[PDB]
């Protein structure tokens, strides 16, 4: 009758609390996976389309008009606005090397910020992937230790009366690994997805700097 539900129903309160701790960690890692999977799918899908739209452009004014109908959450529109805003704040000046430097520094700050702000959940996944085997281990060590002090007194020479206590203890490390394995899988998937996404966003930012860099030098040459 000591089935998984019966072992949980017939376990020590400390190790019951370990089962609940790992089960709640299993819930939150799957909640993070479903929450971020749709975010990466939508944000990467949109950014790939915006890149293929902008790759045709040949001056910064053309890029601003191409992007003009992108939605208000558009990352490429946000970077084009960030570049355009450094021109309009610089309007009374002609240090083109200064404008190119200030713009470069602003865009690299913003790309770093979007990358940091988009790896939001990973602190849970990395922590749970590291520690969930060990809190499961603490549960089984405690369960064994209870069963042992159980044979220390009420001495019972029979193996058959401790075997339930051995299984109830081992179940805590089994539940530990069932929480740990998804956390390490999901963490690597999102580490690789962020790496690809961050580099794609960096290539969009690089196109904005290159377009602006050509345009300022061409304008300065045409002004000669």
């Amino acid at each position: 009758d000591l089935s998984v539900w019966g072992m949980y129903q017939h376990a020590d309160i400390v190790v019951k609390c370990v089962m609940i701790g790992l089960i709640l960690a299993s819930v939150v890692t799957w909640a993070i996976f479903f929450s971020k999977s749709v975010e990466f799918f939508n944000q990467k899908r949109r950014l790939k389309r915006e890149q293929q739209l902008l790759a045709e452009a040949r001056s910064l004014n053309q890029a601003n008009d191409i992007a003009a109908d992108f939605g208000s959450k558009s990352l490429s529109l946000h970077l084009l606005n960030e570049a355009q805003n450094e021109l309009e704040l610089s309007e009374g000046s002609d240090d083109n090397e200064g404008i190119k430097e200030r713009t470069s520094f602003r865009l690299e700050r913003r790309v770093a910020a979007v990358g940091r702000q988009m790896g939001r959940g990973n602190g849970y996944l990395a922590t749970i992937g590291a520690i969930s085997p060990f809190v499961g281990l603490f549960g089984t060590v405690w369960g064994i230790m209870n069963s042992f002090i159980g044979i220390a007194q009420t001495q019972t020479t029979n193996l058959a009366v401790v075997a339930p206590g051995i299984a109830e203890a081992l179940l805590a490390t089994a539940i530990g690994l069932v929480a740990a394995i998804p956390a390490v899988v999901i963490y690597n998937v999102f580490a690789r997805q962020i790496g690809g996404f961050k580099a794609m966003l960096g290539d969009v930012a690089a196109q904005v700097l290159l377009l602006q860099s050509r345009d300022l030098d061409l304008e300065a040459s045409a002004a000669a």
Partner: peptide, 17 residues
């Protein structure tokens, strides 16, 4: 949101027996 609710729903289907 619906991701949190869906996670406890699949754990509800998996814990049954």
């Amino acid at each position: 949101p619906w991701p949190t609710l869906l996670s406890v729903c699949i754990h509800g289907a998996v814990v049954a027996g």
